[PDB]
Amino acid sequence: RSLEPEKVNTIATSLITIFQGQGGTINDILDQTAQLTASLADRDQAIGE
Amino acid sequence: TLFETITAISEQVDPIKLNETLTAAAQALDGLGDKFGRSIVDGNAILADVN
Amino acid sequence: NVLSETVDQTSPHLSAALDGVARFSETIGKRDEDVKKLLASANKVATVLGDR
Amino acid sequence: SSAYPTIERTLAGISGILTGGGIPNIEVIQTEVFNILNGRADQIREFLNQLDTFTDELNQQREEITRAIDSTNRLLNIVSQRNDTLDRVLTEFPPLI
Amino acid sequence: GTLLDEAATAFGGLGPSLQRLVDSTQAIAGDFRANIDPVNDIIENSGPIIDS
Amino acid sequence: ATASILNPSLVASRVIQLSPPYTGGPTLRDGAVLDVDRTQVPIEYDEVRNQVTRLLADLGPTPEQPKGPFGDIIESFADGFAGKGEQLNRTLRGLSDALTALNEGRGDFFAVVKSLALFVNALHRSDQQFVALNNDLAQFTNSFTNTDQ
């Protein structure tokens, strides 16, 4: 019942349209957010105060 | 040979862990899948206005 | 294949992002009541400021 | 010495996976995933692009953000340690004004 | 086996927590879009006062 | 009613079954005609064999992809997420906690936003007036503090 053709085809085409060549973009997002959140978390005591 | 291969595959699934993983994934979006997509579109508009 | 290659590409840059997001989220998540009370008080004060 | 799995053992393992594995949840999960991706693949792609832009811009200002955090911390510490004077002002000045 | 073990470790009992995460994310994003003109005004007009 | 042809078992006599049992309302009168839009046929063994062969050939291993799409995706997910189970669990818990805390104060936060918007939109045009005011205030309070007493 979960192997219905319409849902599988729509999911597959959408995943293709979304992740086509976006490895570099996602790597950049991960690195930038890692650096920003580490910088913000180094001020845990400051934010608490 | 086909039965041996299927058995070798099936001995690795360990249905307890698969069951808890699938239950967590199903509860994660049990009733909000259109809401999350509308959220992504709304965030797209937000970033298009903020950047 | 697309999912396989995307996971292959963006795997080495994942653990650092997970750790950073976890730490920054725990910075606020262990102060839930304080944040909510702060937002309520800020709502009162800012409404007073904006009305006048 | 060994023995090939029988059809009974193979089907028993498959049935164990199918019953004790939470298979019905899949037909929910996939369904909801469909609702996420129905007619919004282009918009999710451009959202990924704009999120990259936004996160890069914030990372370019993380030093200013932490400097503002330290500065606000110091100012709020001083005001908190003078809160008594703040309370006295709020009690006594509005009637005078 | 390794992937299923990792998925079990990552998604042990996070049903309610992930549900709350997704609901909060969608609500915050929708309300933020509904209130984007005040955010634009704050961003583009708070600079002059603070700079002065 | 929908007349469907059924194959009860591996070897059997196929039968026409009227699927919806009668519960009332109008009834199937004599001489009625059922078109193709309300009839069904069994799956047939040839179709099963054709689809099984097609899916095994197209989604199976190839010389360029020795493990096939499913083998490659499970290998990439197993190696790309090795040792990140606990970290992902902690990140998801923290993110859920923080986002729930923000969502419970979402109305207050956006009330703050809508009020600060009016405050700033009314106080932004007078930036030079504010600089003039601060300089005038310093000049005025300097007039009474030229000496100590």
Q: Does the beta carbon of F103 lie under 8 angstroms from any beta carbon of chain E?
A: yes
The C residues from 27 to 46 touching F (CB cutoff 8 Å) are 28-32, 35-36, 39-40, 42-43, 46
Phi-psi region of F42 (alpha: psi -120 to 50; beta: other; left: phi over 0): beta
Of D54, A14, F109, the residue nearest B45 (C-alpha): D54
DSSP D39: S
Q: What residues of E are in contact with residue F120 (Cβ under 8 Å)?
A: 41-42, 45-46, 49
Within chain A, strands assigned E span none
Q: How many CB atoms lie within 10 A of CB F47?
A: 10
Is E8–B20 a contact, with Cβ atoms under 8 angstroms apart? yes
Q: Which long-range contacts (CB under 8 A, 24 or more apart) does D18-23 make?
A: D19/B15, D20/B15, D20/B16, D20/B19, D21/B13, D21/B15, D21/B18, D21/B19, D21/B22, D22/B15, D22/B18, D22/B19, D22/B20, D22/B22, D22/B23, D22/B26, D23/B22
Give the resolution value in Å. 2.9
Taking a C-beta distance cutoff of 8 angstroms, is the pair B18, D21 a contact? Answer: yes
Provide the CB-side half-sphere exposure for F135 (13 A, CA). Answer: 7
Tokens of D24: 């019905």
Distance CA A44, CA C23 (A): 9
Which chain C residue lies closest to F85 (C-alpha atoms)? C15
C35 touches chain A (CB under 8 A): no
Instruction: Quickly list H helices, chain D.
Output: 7-20, 24-37, 41-59, 62-80, 83-96
Cα separation of F69 and F76, whole Å? 10
F33 touching E (Cβ < 8 Å): no
Asked if residue F75 lies in contact with residue E3, where contact means CB atoms within 8 angstroms, the answer is: no
Task: Please report residues of E whose CB lies closer than 8 A to that of B26.
Answer: 15
Residues in F touching C11 (Cβ below 8 Å): 79-81
Residue type, D52: D
Cα–Cα distance list, E20 to B12, E25, F103 (Å): 32, 8, 9
Question: Which two structure tokens, joined as six digits, stand for F124?
Answer: 């932004």
A46 touches chain C (CB under 8 A): no
DSSP letters of F31-60? T----GGGEE----HHHHHHHHHHHHHHSS
Kindly report the CA angle at D49 between D44 and D53, in degrees rounded to 5?
Answer: 140
In chain E, which residue's Cα lies nearest the Cα of F95? E21
Residue F35 sits at φ, ψ, to 5 deg, of -90, -175
Q: Do C20 and A41 touch (CB under 8 A)?
A: yes
Does E38 contact chain B (CB < 8 Å)? no
Q: Name every chain B residue with its beta carbon within 8 A of the beta carbon of D32.
A: 29-33
- Cα F29 to Cα F27: distance, rounded to the nearest angstrom: 6
Question: C25 near F97, Cβ under 8 Å?
Answer: yes
HSE-CB at C12 with a 13 A cutoff on CA atoms is 2
What is the Cα–Cα distance from C14 to F80, expressed in whole angstroms? 9
Q: Give the 3-state secondary structure of residue B45.
A: helix
Distances (CA, A) of B19 to B5, D26, D96, E4, F100: 22, 10, 70, 10, 26
Q: What is the dihedral of CA F113, F116, F122, F128, to 10 degrees?
A: -120
Q: Are B50 and E39 in contact (CB under 8 A)?
A: yes
What DSSP line would sit under B25-44, residue for residue? HHHHTSS-SHHHHHHHHHHH
8 A C-beta contact, residue F37 and residue F1: no
Phi, psi of F5 (to 5 degrees): -80, 130
d(CA B39, CA F139): 54
* C-beta pairs of D71-75 under 8 Å, 24+ apart in sequence: D73/A46, D73/A49
Distances (CA, A) of F131 to D63, D75, F138: 28, 21, 11
Q: Given CB atoms, is D52 within the 8 Å cutoff of chain B?
A: no
**Nearest chain C residue (CA) to F90:** C22
Structure tokens at F8: 């009860």
D44 and chain A in contact, CB less than 8 A: yes
CA atoms within 13 A on the CB side of E30: 14
On whether the CB atoms of residues A10 and D34 are closer than 8 A, the answer is yes
Using the Cα atoms of residue D59, residue D65, residue D70 and residue D76 in order, give the sign of their dihedral.
Answer: negative
**Exposure string (b/e) for F20-39, b if CB count within 10 Å is 16 or more?**
eeeeeeeeeeeeeeeeeeee
Sheet with strand F39-40: strands edge to edge? F15-18, F3-6, F39-40
How far apart CA C17 and CA C11 sit, in angstroms, is 10
In our burial notation (b when 16+ CB lie closer than 10 A, e otherwise), range C1-13 reads ebebebbbbbbeb
**DSSP per-residue codes, chain F:** --EEEE--SSS---EEEE-S---SSS---TT----GGGEE----HHHHHHHHHHHHHHSS--SSSTTHHHHHHHHHHHHHTTT-HHHHHHHHHHHHHHHHHHHHTHHHHHHHHHHHHHHHHHHSTTHHHHHHHHHHHHHHHHTT-SS--
Cβ contacts of residue D63 below 8 Å, gap of 6+? Answer: A39
Give yes or no for C48 touching A (CB within 8 A).
no
Cβ-contact B37, E24 below 8 angstroms: no
Query: Are the Cβ atoms of C16 and A20 closer than 8 angstroms?
Result: no
Residue of chain C with shortest Cα separation from A45: C27
Nearest residue in chain D measured CA to CA from A36: D59
Q: With an 8 Å Cβ cutoff, are D62 and A39 in contact?
A: yes
The identity of residue A9, as a single letter, is N
Question: Is any Cβ of chain E less than 8 angstroms from the Cβ of F70?
Answer: no
Measure the CA–CA gap between F133 and F120, rounded to whole angstroms. Answer: 18
DSSP state of B16: H
Pairing of strands F15-18, F3-6: antiparallel
Residue labelled with tokens 């992809």? F65
At residue F100, φ and ψ (nearest 5 deg) are: -65, -40
Query: Is A26's CB within 8 Å of C6's CB?
Result: yes
d(CA D30, CA D27): 6
DSSP D78: H
Among F59, F79, F87, the strongest candidate for a mutation testing the C interface, having the largest count of C CBs within 10 A, is F87
Check if the beta carbon of residue F99 is closer than 8 Å to that of residue E18. no
Selected for mutation to probe chain D from B5, B46, B51 (highest D CB count within 10 Å) is B51
Evaluate whether B50 touches D50 at the Cβ level (below 8 Å): no
CA neighbor of B10 nearest in space, from D12, D26, D22:
D12
Q: Report d(CA E3, CA C7) in Å as an integer.
A: 13
Contact in structure between B7 and D11 (CB atoms under 8 Å)? no
Cβ–Cβ contact A6 with C under 8 A: no
Experimental determination technique: cryo-EM
E24/F100 CB distance under 8 A:
yes
Distance CA D55, CA D65 (A): 13
* Euclidean distance between CA atoms C25 and E46, whole angstroms: 27
